[PDB]
Amino acid sequence: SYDRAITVFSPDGHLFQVEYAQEAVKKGSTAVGVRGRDIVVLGVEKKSVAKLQDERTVRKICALDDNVCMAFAGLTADARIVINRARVECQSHRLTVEDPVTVEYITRYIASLKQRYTQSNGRRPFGISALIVGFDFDGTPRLYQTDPSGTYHAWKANAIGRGAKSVREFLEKNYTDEAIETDDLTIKLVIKALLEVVQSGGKNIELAVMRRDQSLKILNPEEIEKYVAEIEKEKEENEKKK
Amino acid sequence: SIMSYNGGAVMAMKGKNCVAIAADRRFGIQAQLVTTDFQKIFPMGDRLYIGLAGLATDVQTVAQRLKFRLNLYELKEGRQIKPYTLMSMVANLLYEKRFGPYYTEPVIAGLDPKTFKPFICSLDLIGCPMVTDDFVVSGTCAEQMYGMCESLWEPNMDPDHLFETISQAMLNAVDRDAVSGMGVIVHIIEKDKITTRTLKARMD
Amino acid sequence: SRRYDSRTTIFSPEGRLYQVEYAMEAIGHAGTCLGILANDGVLLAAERRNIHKLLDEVFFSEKIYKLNEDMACSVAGITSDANVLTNELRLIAQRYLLQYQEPIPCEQLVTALCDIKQAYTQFGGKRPFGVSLLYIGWDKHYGFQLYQSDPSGNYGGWKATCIGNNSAAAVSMLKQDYKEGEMTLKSALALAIKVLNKTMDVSKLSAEKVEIATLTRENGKTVIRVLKQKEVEQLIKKHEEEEAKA
Amino acid sequence: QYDNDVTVWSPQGRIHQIEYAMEAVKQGSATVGLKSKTHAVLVALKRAQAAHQKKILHVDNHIGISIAGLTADARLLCNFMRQECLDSRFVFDRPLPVSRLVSLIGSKTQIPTQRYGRRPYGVGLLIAGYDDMGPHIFQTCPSANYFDCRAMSIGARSQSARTYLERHMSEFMECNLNELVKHGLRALRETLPAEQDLTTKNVSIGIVGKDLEFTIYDDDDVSPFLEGLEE
Amino acid sequence: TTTLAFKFRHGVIVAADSRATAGAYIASQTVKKVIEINPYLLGTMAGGAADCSFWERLLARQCRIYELRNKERISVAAASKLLANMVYQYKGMGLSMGTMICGWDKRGPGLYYVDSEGNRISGATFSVGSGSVYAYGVMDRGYSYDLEVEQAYDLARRAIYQATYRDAYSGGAVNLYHVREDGWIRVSSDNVADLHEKYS
Amino acid sequence: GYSFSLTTFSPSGKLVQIEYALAAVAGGAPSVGIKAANGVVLATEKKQKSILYDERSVHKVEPITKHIGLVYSGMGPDYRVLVHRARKLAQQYYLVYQEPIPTAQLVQRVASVMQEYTQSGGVRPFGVSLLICGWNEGRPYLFQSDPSGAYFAWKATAMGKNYVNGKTFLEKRYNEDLELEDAIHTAILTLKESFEGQMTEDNIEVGICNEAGFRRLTPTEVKDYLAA
Amino acid sequence: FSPYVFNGGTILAIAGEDFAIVASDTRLSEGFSIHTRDSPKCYKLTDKTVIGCSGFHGDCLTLTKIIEARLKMYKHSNNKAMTTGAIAAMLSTILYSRRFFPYYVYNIIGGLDEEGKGAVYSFDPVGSYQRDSFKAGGSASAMLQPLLDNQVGFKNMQNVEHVPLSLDRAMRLVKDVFISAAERDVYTGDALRICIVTKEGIREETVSLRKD
Amino acid sequence: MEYLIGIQGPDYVLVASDRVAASNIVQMKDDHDKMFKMSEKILLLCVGEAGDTVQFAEYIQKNVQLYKMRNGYELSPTAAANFTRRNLADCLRSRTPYHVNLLLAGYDEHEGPALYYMDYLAALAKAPFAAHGYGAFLTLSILDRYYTPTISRERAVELLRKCLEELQKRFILNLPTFSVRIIDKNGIHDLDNISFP
Amino acid sequence: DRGVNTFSPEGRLFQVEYDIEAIKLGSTAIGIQTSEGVCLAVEKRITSPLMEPSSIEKIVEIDAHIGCAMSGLIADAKTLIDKARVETQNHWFTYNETMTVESVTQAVSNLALQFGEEDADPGAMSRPFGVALLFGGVDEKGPQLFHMDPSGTFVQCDARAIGSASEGAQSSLQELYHKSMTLKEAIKSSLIILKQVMEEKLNATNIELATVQPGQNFHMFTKEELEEVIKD
């Protein structure tokens, strides 16, 4: 067997393997999440479309179960493994306990898995930062986040991947109760946000939406273009106002 | 016993340049019918068939594991398998479980894809192969077919006489057994064709 | 026992692994391979490197392999490491058949492999596998399927791909001359013979520095066939004539 | 570099890791123990820094210890001793002696000095006990070497106490209990920076003999032994 | 042994006897057969006492661990599932156990029956032990869902008394518990000799 | 035991230890293998450096079974390992199928092992490339394996010290319709160009694969052939 | 072969407001013979707790050794003596440990409650215990248990006063009971040992019976 | 005791069972349920020993739901049946063998309906109708007498009622109420329980 | 390179002396005891005005009578806390009584220096935990508070601060203590200390507060049970 110390401390604490794993996320694909009043939105983007790819195969929005979804902003091989482990645990929990899982349960599970690999011998830390979302019992939409260190915090509107700094700075100044009032409104926010990191318009978007008991959805480019033109018209009107 | 928990019967003969195989198609639990379309004869390559009898679960398990190994063999190097090699493989597969074995009695029948030389074989509970030119029998109605095939068989047999021979024997041998019957299936092989037939039997 | 190790699995200061992105540098000097899917079949072309007084045509082929009744692969890296992944794939398919008594879909077979070489990047201490592949197959859910793979457990489906030496120029010249759902198995072979001599460094093809395989469905059964020297000679001659038409 | 591992002899036959461990005993609070004709004593300092940890433990009715190294590894050896004594009492029905126990402890500590990836225990120990042959005082160091002495002390600036004892050596074997206590306490008093005097919130003392099973005294019961001091 | 339990509008009620025998010799007559797992759960003893105590203690410990980790009281269904999956690993060794788990969760009252063989089942009226057969007759003819509290007590008490009258391996004292939305309470503990005169 | 690989990918993408092993067979007592219709021929060369040495004790051409041969070019000590492994795999195949093992399968398994000794815990690659001959269903077979695990189905190849100058000599003489009498002449004469000093029998070893079983020729035969 | 034996050795215990009593016979037997007549079955664990065992002798001895080895472990790991309830709760588990190869001893524990009262715990070879006031486990259980329940529980006695127990009364009652339970049982006799636990400490007595 | 029955039509499937539990003299329950839903159009009816049924059924259920949530589609019944058979024959030769019988009625979009059979020894037959338990003796013949391949729906229901009346007439055990379900191209449907006063 | 169980030329392990420097980056926490219970207060160190502050759990419950505050790496702590809990319950299982805080802290410390490459490492432990804990709870002998480092050398105390700025604040906490001090004064003193040491502000959201006073069990202060005292 292999029993060697891969990740270890430094003169300033400064676990180096984690500091490095956090750099891949800084170059991966942007992702955005939003927790509306009766809807939750995921607007993963930064897709590099080549025109000769089956959109099904490489997706990056995955369902762990009818209640929970997920998005990631790093290495894919590891994300697949994590998602498989999580589905396994969701089923085992639904087996022992006679009720489905809660967001916090699976988030804590993934965090423990991430941390075990920062202390074990012969193992290398993961290189993903996930973005989980779900609908607990009695509604109560929930959006969480995770890092390769093992932490996790509940956010209202957080973004990861490259360009997430500008996205957060733009979102912290636009998310308001009077701005979130309907399902059609929550989505526009995500498109306006991604328009910044966006390169050549609405050609790279994989929006979705989770509502009460739909269990998933994905939109076709028609409504994407409709929303893009609506945002353009709103921008023109606002510019006329200024 | 445990072998006769369900019931089964299979036979195989040899001719001039064509072989034959036959079986019954009943499934039941120790006194009772469940269905009359049970499969016991499986094709292991072209011009090569195998029939099992005994415990049904072991029947299917052996069939599946044999298909596993045979497909891997065929893919490794591309050659349709020979009968003697199959005999040896089944021997190994049944002897690996000398302690905690299966309860099937296989019967193999096929040709050679270089001279079309016929070949038939019968193994035992633990892999005691017994090559015979006359014929081979396996099941619970064995002493009712030994004395039947020893009184009709002849050295050289045309396909039609080969079909008329194995059929009468099988039918009039199962008509004296209670845990085997309810249909008969026959397969005749040739140099360039195969013919499968079903007969008219009593359902009592 | 610590001054002899490279640790084999380490995040570089920039968040990238080095051994994997190195093996990807050798993959780009192996046998050119190309894959296309057409409404009525799927074709897989490859380029050979050995031209000597050899015992050719001794096996089914040199670069094409088989995995089951309805699948095939076109590995384009190190041969020694590839001779075992085919065994793994066959084992996987036979276990799936043994359990569910049905042919294995292709996506499952690709994933169960892209997971085997992921551990080699995390656990252990071993150098990873250095081969990228190209799977072709047919299933009753999505029909014809062409898939790819990479040294670090990373895969993706396509319509038309090329890997090996000069794969980028091919992928570029190919995304323009490909009609969506306006293709057949009679013109796909033509486009293949076109890109292969537009990419290969030799002045022209002699039908001896090439190889082709086609997978189709004929009367329920699935056929995986390789072309004889005469068929490829006729194909290259027809390509010559078509080009002469200009 | 011959300093980073414990399986590399130096060109002059010196394993640097064992010395580097030994250097961990000359930084902790000092401790002292001397022998008499009938009893055995141990003391300590309990350098508070405003609370600090204890510095004396109990092994069994006739054996006790004083530690001057890493407190985490000392509990390990303590557990080892307790279990060995329990086993000897369960099987033979007899109190395990001191010599065989110290030999066991020495063997337990030699292994990691002879293989890879291990480290030596960085704790020194003073052991006091009593058996058929009278009292016994033993010393233990990181290296698996144990001595048998009439008086010893360990910790920082323990040279002054050693000299004071070498000068007062020919006085034991006849002093009473309280006289031994006073001798020990006035010997320890020299390991201070001539700016502090021994008090009740610093000293901890254990005592064993043929009539008592290793009693310990806390800060509230040490005062009786403080009278009779000088400058 | 005789242990019964039934649920109705105002929750669940449990009742048990207090005798223990070793062959034909009465060892003790003051046993506790209604186990107090937690301030929100209850148990029951029948068969082997050592087992029906050890495994229920383990169950209580696991329930507390769950409550600490997830910050939410466990449910009855999951508790009985745990208890059943715990002893199933000891099938065919000699274990004897028959148990009733009672509680009140977010979806209302709950009563489950469990045993060493493996059959775990819900219900509304249950009774086990050597005298369950005599108690079923009295519980059925007299049961009702829209009952009051002052009457279910007498019902269970009379069932237990009539079971002890005939069965020889059961007698002594009668213990009775009542569970509510908040928690359970110990309502009384009577004697058979003091009930015989209350009746004829 | 150490658990980590010593063969690793370089920045340019190539395994370097494999190349360094392939540089060992350069000095490997040149060998030769030729194919004909009635069989196959294998011929080595020996380098006894004293008259005090013996001759009837050391053998490079060692059989695997009644129909398969073997020869090497490189490290001797690392060749008996593969000989033993192959003699084991052959007997396993027999015990299973009750039939002699074909040649190609043997080459496959041997190469699988030679590759498994490439990314395991605390070992190095071998220092030999084998050449193995066989006869199956009325046809000869010649194969050549490498220290990397790759095998090719060659036809009158050569390897050793002067192979770049031994394959061009062998290209302009292979008629492809030869009998098992002049292929031996060709084998001898090829290495006759890479031999220093006077040649004889004790400096040479030969084996053939006809439809009777792999055989090794005694000094009498080699002497008879050495006479032109 | 048979890995068990029968030696006899009835035991008796009693609890009071501020005292506890534990009585045993003194004899060892095997079949129809007598091994010895000086083998008490009462042992002292701490200054306020004693215990008695009966049945197979080897198991008794090894169990005593185990308990004595674990009390010191607790004292070392927690820096305090162990109570009575704790010893009972530990003994339940120690016994259940061997559920499929059990001991064959009927244990009884007596001592002082937490505050000042008297406590008794009766056990079984599997580990089911419950607190009681008086118990007479052993071979002659059937002879003493039906008696201690009348003169101490006042059962089947009408118009009788409670008149709580005392020390000398209980001692004399124990003496008379064991003197009467020796002329009918054959495994019991030749002496009688009493251990008494009070606020002060642990005291012992000794009495002589008939020699068969 | 126990009773399971399954019937197959041209475009549907009809399954039924009893709902009763007992301990050797007394029936503890009268609203039991011996069915299990592995997927949207698959149904497992298990019966037999005490604690093995639920264990096996839940194992199978978890693994099937996992396949679904992992791949993107469902599993065909002809595959789930062989999966069950393999697992059961494997666990038959270990320290923890399971003693159960089961049917696996289902429906598919390509091959149509299906009905299978097992006998706690991992046989896996297949028939247009089948039954389990002792009662099977008094209700199999009836089928063979009145069954036709082109049997409609209400006629199958009537045949079922006939078999149940025969059971309640000649069988010693009570078995007073049954649970019946149907499977069709749109999914699973539950019908009014067949009860006899 | 070097190993994990390697000494320095001072008698000091290396990984531990390096990890102790990590706690100088974490937030601060204060623990106090008195004659009628203890008090634990902690900081949150918010970053953005979009994180749900109710998700930060820095003061957890080990049992009805024990508590814990932590600083350093919140992740590495999740492995120890559970252990503690487990231990406690097992005690109650075998002895039917409550565990002492000394015993709990000792059992936790026994798991600190278990790390190395030699062993097969089934526990896989490869380095020490970077955390500093602060326990507190009632026992058989009044209330107790303790302190733990990443080296397993727990020592009892009376009032202690840990974290980044636990250098000068300890002085202020060293001045304001008297054996007869009550609970309210201690709480106010800890709060004003956190105010003077904190940077942003002092709201009833950026703090967690807890008590283990006798008679009652562990308690966490609500959002409404806090601001009523900050009005100073």
Swiss-Prot record, chain C:
SMART domains: Proteasome_A_N. GO terms for cellular component: cytosol; nucleus; P-body; proteasome core complex; proteasome core complex, alpha-subunit complex. PROSITE patterns: PROTEASOME_ALPHA_1, PROTEASOME_ALPHA_2. The modification Phosphoserine is found at S12, S74, S172. Keywords: Acetylation, Cytoplasm, Nucleus, Phosphoprotein, Proteasome. CDD domains: proteasome_alpha_type_4 (cd03752). The modification N6-acetyllysine is found at K126, K175. GO terms for biological process: proteasome-mediated ubiquitin-dependent protein catabolic process. It is found in: Cytoplasm; Nucleus. It holds the Pfam family Proteasome. Its main location: cytoplasm. PANTHER family: PROTEASOME SUBUNIT ALPHA/BETA. The 26S proteasome consists of a 20S proteasome core and two 19S regulatory subunits. The 20S proteasome core is a barrel-shaped complex made of 28 subunits that are arranged in four stacked rings. The two outer rings are each formed by seven alpha subunits, and the two inner rings are formed by seven beta subunits. The proteolytic activity is exerted by three beta-subunits PSMB5, PSMB6 and PSMB7. Component of the 20S core proteasome complex involved in the proteolytic degradation of most intracellular proteins. This complex plays numerous essential roles within the cell by associating with different regulatory particles. Associated with two 19S regulatory particles, forms the 26S proteasome and thus participates in the ATP-dependent degradation of ubiquitinated proteins. Belongs to the peptidase T1A family. This is Proteasome subunit alpha type-4. The gene is PSMA4.
UniProtKB/Swiss-Prot annotation, chain D:
It is found in: Cytoplasm; Nucleus. Transmembrane segments: none annotated. There is a cross-link at K108, K201 (Glycyl lysine isopeptide (Lys-Gly) (interchain with G-Cter in ubiquitin)). Gene3D superfamilies: Glutamine Phosphoribosylpyrophosphate, subunit 1, domain 1 (3.60.20.10). Component of the 20S core proteasome complex involved in the proteolytic degradation of most intracellular proteins. This complex plays numerous essential roles within the cell by associating with different regulatory particles. Associated with two 19S regulatory particles, forms the 26S proteasome and thus participates in the ATP-dependent degradation of ubiquitinated proteins. PANTHER family: PROTEASOME SUBUNIT ALPHA/BETA. The 26S proteasome consists of a 20S proteasome core and two 19S regulatory subunits. The 20S proteasome core is a barrel-shaped complex made of 28 subunits that are arranged in four stacked rings. The two outer rings are each formed by seven alpha subunits, and the two inner rings are formed by seven beta subunits. The proteolytic activity is exerted by three beta-subunits PSMB5, PSMB6 and PSMB7. Interacts with NOTCH3. Interacts with ZFAND1. This is Proteasome subunit alpha type-1.
Curated annotation (Swiss-Prot), chain E:
It catalyses: Cleavage of peptide bonds with very broad specificity. Keywords: Cytoplasm, Hydrolase, Nucleus, Protease, Proteasome, Threonine protease, Zymogen. It comes from the Eukaryota. Its main location: cytoplasm. Bortezomib binds at A49. It is found in: Cytoplasm; Nucleus. It is an enzyme of class 3 (hydrolase). GO terms for molecular function: endopeptidase activity; threonine-type endopeptidase activity. Its EC number is 3.4.25.1. One of its GO terms (cellular component) is centrosome. The keyword Phosphoprotein does not apply. The keyword NAD does not apply. Component of the 20S core proteasome complex involved in the proteolytic degradation of most intracellular proteins. This complex plays numerous essential roles within the cell by associating with different regulatory particles. Associated with two 19S regulatory particles, forms the 26S proteasome and thus participates in the ATP-dependent degradation of ubiquitinated proteins. This is Proteasome subunit beta type-5. It comes from Bos taurus (Bovine).
UniProtKB/Swiss-Prot annotation, chain G:
Glycans are attached at S29, S180. It is found in: Cytoplasm; Nucleus. GO terms for biological process: proteolysis involved in protein catabolic process. Keywords: Acetylation, Cytoplasm, Glycoprotein, Nucleus, Phosphoprotein, Proteasome. GO terms for cellular component: cytoplasm; cytosol; nucleus; proteasome core complex; proteasome core complex, beta-subunit complex. The modification Phosphotyrosine is found at Y121. InterPro entries: Ntn_hydrolases_N, Proteasome_bsu_CS, Proteasome_sua/b, Proteasome_suB-type. The modification Phosphoserine is found at S33, S39, S133. The modification N6-acetyllysine is found at K175. Transmembrane segments: none annotated. PROSITE patterns: PROTEASOME_BETA_1, PROTEASOME_BETA_2. CDD domains: proteasome_beta_type_1. Pfam families: Proteasome. Belongs to the peptidase T1B family. The 26S proteasome consists of a 20S proteasome core and two 19S regulatory subunits. The 20S proteasome core is a barrel-shaped complex made of 28 subunits that are arranged in four stacked rings. The two outer rings are each formed by seven alpha subunits, and the two inner rings are formed by seven beta subunits. The proteolytic activity is exerted by three beta-subunits PSMB5, PSMB6 and PSMB7. Interacts with SERPINB2. Interacts with RFPL4A. This is Proteasome subunit beta type-1.
